[PDB]
Structure 1
Amino acid sequence: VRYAATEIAPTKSARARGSYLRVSFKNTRETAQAINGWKLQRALTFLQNVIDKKEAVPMRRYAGSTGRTAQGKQWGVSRARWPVKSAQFLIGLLKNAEANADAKGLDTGNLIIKHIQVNQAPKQRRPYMSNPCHIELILTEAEETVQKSEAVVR
């Protein structure tokens, strides 16, 4: 039969969650998609350089025509925007996962963002409806490589 790709060891990963967060789902999803797959320190610098104004976040699926500058040249997207609150929430969850990895015993210099998922939260019943979200990110260690030994003769 076919065997699914087994999960990485819980001693090599660190998970952070945030539920019923009062930030917009679309902006948070686009911000999470921008930082998906990166190294941890690179994501830290990008979110801190998008909290204070230098760097842009491109939008691809939930893309609204707001700004058209050169900061989208590196992403190849002509539509770029700068959500702020989603960056603060992602920053808070990233330091939460850093604290979890430090407590668990992981090397915090080789942490990469394995996966980050933004789901929809229940809508706030006040016709104007708020769009909260859940965020679940899992950081892992960089994959370690061991040199083989030459086979023996018999």
Structure 2
Amino acid sequence: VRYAATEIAPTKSARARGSYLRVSFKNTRETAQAINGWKLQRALTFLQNVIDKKEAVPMRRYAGSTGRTAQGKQWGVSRARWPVKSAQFLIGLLKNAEANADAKGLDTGNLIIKHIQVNQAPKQRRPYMSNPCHIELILTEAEETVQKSEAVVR
């Protein structure tokens, strides 16, 4: 039979969740896709630069023609914006998972974001509807490989 790819061990992992966050789902989905599969320190610098209006977030799926700056040359996408609240909610979620990893005894300088996922929260019932979101994310240490012994003949 087939066997699915098993989960990396929980003591090598670190989890963080955010539910019912009053933040736009289309913007947070585009912000989370920008930093998926990055280093932890790489992501915290990028999301802080988005806060300080330095580096822009490309818009790919939920893309609206708002800005066309030269900062999109590093992504290849001609549409860019600056999600501030989406960066702030994702920063506090990444810092939460960094604190969780240190409680579990993980190496702070070598987490990567292997899993980020944005869902939709229930709509806030007020003709105008808000679009909140759920966010969950998992950090793990980089895969460490050790050397093999030379095989012994007998």
Under TM normalisation by the shorter chain, which class is it? Answer: over 0.9
- Superposed CA offset, 1:44-65 (max 9, x none): 0000111011101001100000
Counterpart CA distance in 2 for 1:114 and 1:24 is: 23
Q: Secondary structure of 2:74's match? A: coil
RMSD: 0.4
- TM-score normalised over the length of structure 1: 0.99
Counterpart CA distance in 2 for 1:36 and 1:20 is: 21
Runs of 5+ unmatched residues, structure 2: none
Q: Secondary structure of 1:65's match? A: coil
- Superposed CA offset, 1:107-131 (max 9, x none): 0100000110000000000000000
- TM-score normalised over the length of structure 2: 0.99
- Superposed CA offset, 1:42-88 (max 9, x none): 00000011101110100110000000010000000000111100000
Q: Secondary structure of 1:109's match? A: helix
The structure 1 segments of at least 4 consecutive aligned residues displaced by more than 4 Å after TM superposition are: none
Aligned equivalent of 2:10: 10
Identity over aligned pairs, percent: 100
Alignment of 1:109 with 2:109, yes or no, is yes
Aligned equivalent of 1:34: 34
Counterpart CA distance in 2 for 1:76 and 1:95 is: 29
User: How far off its partner does 1:5 sit?
Assistant: 0.3
Counterpart CA distance in 1 for 2:49 and 2:59 is: 17
Counterpart CA distance in 1 for 2:94 and 2:112 is: 11
User: How far off its partner does 1:145 sit?
Assistant: 0.7
